[PDB]
């Protein structure tokens, strides 16, 4: 698998080996969010994020550019057809645990 570690303010290009898919990450955080895998980008005719996340673009399988910020720490999946997944681990340096 793919296991990545970066800093906030950096950018990391991440892809798959998919079979027309959907990127679907889960993050060990809750900045207004909740527990569980949340799909962030899907194929259509020209893939875009729309309103939950606003820092990933798309190089234009599929390749994306992601601006790390603080809290994007999480596993990024690239769920294709019939459980044709392609997980990528991501860890940003820092623990924001203050309420």
């Amino acid at each position, epitope marked *: *698998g*793919a*296991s*990545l*570690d*970066g*800093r906030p303010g*950096d950018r*990391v290009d991440l*892809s798959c080996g998919g079979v027309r898919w959907v990127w679907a990450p889960s993050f060990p955080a809750c900045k207004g969010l909740s527990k569980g895998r949340r799909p962030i980008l899907w194929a259509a005719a020209a893939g875009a994020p729309t309103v939950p996340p606003l820092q990933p673009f798309v190089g234009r399988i599929r390749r994306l550019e992601l601006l790390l910020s603080a809290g994007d720490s999480g596993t990024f999946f690239c769920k294709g057809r019939h459980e044709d997944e392609s997980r990528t*681990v991501l*860890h940003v*340096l*820092g*623990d924001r645990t203050y309420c």
Partner: antibody
Amino acid sequence: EVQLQQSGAELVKPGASVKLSCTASGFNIKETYIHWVKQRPEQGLEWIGRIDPADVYGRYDPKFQGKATITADTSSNSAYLQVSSLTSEDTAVYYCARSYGSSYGIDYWGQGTSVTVSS
Amino acid sequence: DIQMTQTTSSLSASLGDRVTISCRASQDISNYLNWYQQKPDGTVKLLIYYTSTLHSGVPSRFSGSGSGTDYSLTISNLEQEDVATYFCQQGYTLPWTFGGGTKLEIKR
């Protein structure tokens, strides 16, 4: 001034545990990942594991099966490698290095700390 | 645990010649491969990060190549200060792995 102050060489009895030190000069360790490396006498380099100093739990190679437990102290701006149940297969030089991430690698490397495992 | 193999463990080369250190990987490293130069009993330097990218203050003579699985390090117009071992290092996945190494000897 980017300096990584490694602790002096240690002579340890087999079976015992050693906690090696690494102190950060100028830079704040909170700003990088700490990585430790093994180097068997006249042999290749072996990545032991890394740590985000902001967290308690370091992530290491399965070869160093619960023996090596990297734990950094932010307050003292220094990281530590604790390697338990020692053997002659552990008599090596231990490097401490700072990395900014996957696309940057270990940029500043420590001098090394020699550990000799012998009775 | 992804393995890294350098085709050669020792390479003898004349001064000012062109030499290459090849590196084969078990998986697609996606350019996440770094090179290191550990001088004899000297410090270990980061030569070239993210394949072709060079570290600050590293001479131009050093060039990084490769994609997919086989990546390479290339050194032109060889110097008498380049006698050191060179290591390949992946960072694509978390059990970060180093290559066996290739000691660079100078012919005479």
